[model samples]
Target: AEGDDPAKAAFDSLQASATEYIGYAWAMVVVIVGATIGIKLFKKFTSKAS
Candidate 1:
């Protein structure tokens, strides 16, 4: 309809997109950080060269 507010609709659309992107970014960061710490701790106790 011509009366529909395009600005408000666009604002809502962008908000949803931003939320989805942030969620994915956080999940990726968690996985990477967990792997990094896991590897670090594993190597600390399993040093074969010593």
Candidate 2:
């Protein structure tokens, strides 16, 4: 029933899964840094106003 090479199929599937997780991890880091900076800036501005 199958025609394509199983080795290539497995390699591609693994590659795709790895890439998806890597992308998610990268996005998470960016969000964390952005939130940290936002909080610091918000505090600084609020302090100056008060």
Candidate 3:
């Protein structure tokens, strides 16, 4: 009863929140980077063709 448990719940909740936040950040990074690269390539390829 004295040391049944307490920290685990908070730790797990914080860990899960951090994990989700990391994933959301990464997804945004990937999308931004991908769009940047794609736009550059499209312009480069079309300029050469024109």
Candidate 4:
């Protein structure tokens, strides 16, 4: 997965995932979960400074 061309690597990963069914749903779920966790963590740390 290591490559100087990040766009190519990303495209390759997407292509690799295409073989699996429900990848879109899975990717969306992962995005939502990651975003939720990231936002929560950000708020937690920011609030701690107050």
Candidate 5:
């Protein structure tokens, strides 16, 4: 996979999770949780700077 062509790699990387799982719904859940945590952390740490 590391040595894959850029276009092929990008295509595979983007679709690999859906290929591994039942559907994109689970993938969306994961993305939502990660985004929630990341945004909260960003705001929490930045607000402390004031």
Candidate 6:
């Protein structure tokens, strides 16, 4: 017996697409926060030097 369900296939494709986007969003969040922290630290150091 061959297993072929159109609804299941569509649902799986959509779920996979959603999961990929979630992963990309998480990565962006991490990068943005890291850059913000680095900039804050640099500013503080420069302020102290001047």
lDDT of each: 0.60, 0.61, 0.61, 0.64, 0.62, 0.60
Residue-by-residue lDDT tens digits, candidate 6, 1-50: 43666577666555544565653435565687678866776786784445
Judging by lDDT against the true structure, name the best candidate.
Answer: 4
Candidate 4 residue lDDT tens string, 1-50: 55667587666567546756644635765677688877776786785544
Q: What is the lDDT of residue 43 in candidate 2?
A: 82
Residue pairs clashing, model 6: none
The 10 consecutive residues of candidate 2 with the worst lDDT sum are: 16-25
TM-score against native, each model: 0.36, 0.33, 0.35, 0.34, 0.32, 0.33
Backbone N/Cα/C clashes per model: 0, 0, 0, 0, 0, 0
Against the true structure, what is every candidate's RMSD? 12.3, 12.0, 12.3, 5.9, 5.4, 12.4
What lDDT, from 0 to 1, does candidate 3 have?
A: 0.61
Q: For candidate 3, lDDT tens digit of each residue in 1-50?
A: 32736676666455544665653434565677688867776786884555
The order of the candidates by lDDT, greatest first, is 4, 5, 2, 3, 6, 1
The TM-score of candidate 1 is 0.36
- lDDT tens digits, residue span 3-33, model 1: 6675777655555446656534345656776
Q: What is the lDDT of residue 29 in candidate 2?
A: 57
Estimate candidate 5's alpha-carbon lDDT, on a 0 to 1 scale. Answer: 0.62
Candidate 3 segments exceeding 4 Å error: 1-25, 47-50
Worst 10 residues of 5 by lDDT: 16-25
* Model 6 spans with C-alpha error above 4 angstroms: 1-25, 45-50
Give lDDT: candidate 3, residue 44: 65
